[PDB]
Paper text:
pmcAmyloid formation of α-synuclein (α-syn) is a pathological feature of Parkinson’s disease (PD), multiple-system atrophy (MSA), and dementia with Lewy bodies. An abundant presynaptic protein, α-syn is 140 amino acids in length with a putative biological function in aiding the exocytosis of synaptic vesicles, in which the first 89 N-terminal residues fold into a helical structure upon membrane association. In its disease-associated, aggregated amyloid state, residues 37 through 97 adopt β-sheet structure, which overlaps with the lipid-binding domain. Notably, both N- and C-terminal α-syn truncations are associated with PD.
Out of the three ∆N-constructs studied, 41‒140 fibrils had the most homogenous population, and thus, the fibril structure of 41‒140 was successfully determined by cryo-EM at near-atomic resolution. Interestingly, the density map of cryo-EM three-dimensional (3D) reconstruction shows two asymmetrical protofilaments intertwining into a left-handed helix with the helical twist of −1.64° with a half pitch ∼52 nm, similar to our negative-stain TEM. The fibril structure was determined at an overall resolution of 3.2 Å, with clear side-chain density that permitted unambiguous de novo atomic model building. A different number of residues was resolved for the two asymmetric protofilaments, comprising residues E46‒K96 and E61‒D98 for chains A and B, respectively. Chain A folds into a β-strand–rich architecture including the β-arch kernel (E57–T72) that is present in other full-length α-syn structures. Chain B adopts a dramatically different β-hairpin conformation. Unlike chain A, the lack of density for N-terminal residues G41–K60 suggests conformational flexibility in this region for this protomer. The β-arch motif in chain A is stabilized by a previously documented intramolecular salt bridge between K58 and E61 (24, 31, 37, 38) and hydrogen-bonding between H50 and E83. An intermolecular salt bridge is formed by K80 in chain A and E83 in chain B, an interaction not observed in other structures. Additional hydrogen-bonding is found between the two Q62 residues. This interface has a calculated buried surface area of 442 Å2 with an estimated total binding energy of −7.87 kcal/mol which is nearly twice of that of the steric zipper between residues H50 and E57 in the full-length protein (239 Å2 and −4.49 kcal/mol).
Numbering used by the authors:
A (entry chain E), B (entry chain G), C (entry chain D), D (entry chain C), E (entry chain B), F (entry chain A): 46 to 96
G (entry chain L): 67 to 95
H (entry chain K), I (entry chain J), J (entry chain I), K (entry chain H), L (entry chain F): 61 to 98
The structure:
Amino acid sequence: EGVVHGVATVAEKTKEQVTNVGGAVVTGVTAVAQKTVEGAGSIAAATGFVK
Amino acid sequence: EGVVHGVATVAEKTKEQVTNVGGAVVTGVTAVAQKTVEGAGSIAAATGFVK
Amino acid sequence: EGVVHGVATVAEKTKEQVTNVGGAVVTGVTAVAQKTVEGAGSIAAATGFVK
Amino acid sequence: EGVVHGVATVAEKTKEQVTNVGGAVVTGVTAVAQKTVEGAGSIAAATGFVK
Amino acid sequence: EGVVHGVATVAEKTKEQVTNVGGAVVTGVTAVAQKTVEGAGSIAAATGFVK
Amino acid sequence: EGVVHGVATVAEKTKEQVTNVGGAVVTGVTAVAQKTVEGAGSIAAATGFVK
Amino acid sequence: GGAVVTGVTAVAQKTVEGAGSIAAATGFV
Amino acid sequence: EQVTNVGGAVVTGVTAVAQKTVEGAGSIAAATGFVKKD
Amino acid sequence: EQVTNVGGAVVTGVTAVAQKTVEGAGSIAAATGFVKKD
Amino acid sequence: EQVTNVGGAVVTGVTAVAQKTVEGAGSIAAATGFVKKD
Amino acid sequence: EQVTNVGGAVVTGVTAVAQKTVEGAGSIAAATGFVKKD
Amino acid sequence: EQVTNVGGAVVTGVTAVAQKTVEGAGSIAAATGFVKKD
């Protein structure tokens, strides 16, 4: 049935070289954030700088 | 059935070298953020700078 | 049945070298955030800087 | 039946090396954050800087 | 039946080496955060900096 | 039947090496934070910095 | 070969579904 | 066969900031002060 | 067969920072003070 | 068959910091003070 | 067959902090002061 | 078959900390000052 409303991601990390010798690095494998609804309902959101 | 509303992604990371010497870098494998709806409903969102 | 509303992610870490000498590093495997509803309901959320 | 509303993640750690001499490193396998409702309910959540 | 509302996570640790000599390291396997309701219920959660 | 609302996580540790001489290390497997209500009830939780 | 940098500010960020503001400046004399 | 040889690697005074944010907000502000009088 | 060779690796005065945030907020601010009088 | 060779690895004075936050908030502020008179 | 070879590994004056937070709040503030007169 | 080879491994003055928080709050602040006059 695969994926209906969500998303699908596949990855294979065979060989990677990362040398951190002069700074800072951040890396990641597929972080996700999800807001979904099926029927009657309401998702109200304010994400960011709101003040 | 594959994908109905969301998207699909495949990425095989075979061989990669990144050299961090004169600064900083960020990268990752396909982060995603999703909002979808099936029937009657509402997603009311404001993302960014709102003030 | 796969995934209906959520998302699907697969990753394989075969060989990876990270050498952290000239600074700091952060990395992760698929952290997730999820808010969903099925029927008549309400998720109301404000995430970030609200003031 | 797989997963209905939540998300699905699989990872395999075959071989990974992290050496950290001149800084700090944080890493992890799939931390999760989830809020969900089924029927007549409500989730109200302000996460971040609220003031 | 798999998982209905929660999430699914599988990870295998074949071979990994963390060598940390001149800094601090933190790592872990799948810490989770969850708040869910089924029927007539409510969750109100302010997390972060609230003041 | 798996898990209805809770989450599912499996992990195997074949071989992992940690060495720490001049810093701090913390390692963990499946730390849990959960709150769940099914019928008539509620949960109010403010966690973090409240002042 | 040489890799000699005088003095540097370096900024990198990725944001998905939010907002981010970078503000950097260097002082060299 | 992928190889990298860093010969000198001499960077004197640096500020380096990286961040990743999903579903939120993050603002970063950095500044360097360098003076090589001689 | 991948190989990294770092010859010198000399970085004198540095501040470095990375962070990841999912479903929240995070602001970092850094600054360096360097003076090489000689 | 991957290999790392760090020849010198000399980083005089640094501050470094990383963090991951899921479902919360985290703000950091760092700064270095360096003076190499010579 | 992966191997790490650190030749020099010299970091004179450093401070480093890392944290992970799930469902909470955490703020860190670090600083260094180094003076190598010679 | 992975091996660890640390040749020099010299850290003069350091201060490092790490923490993990699940369902709570945790904030630390640390700093170092080193003076290598010579």
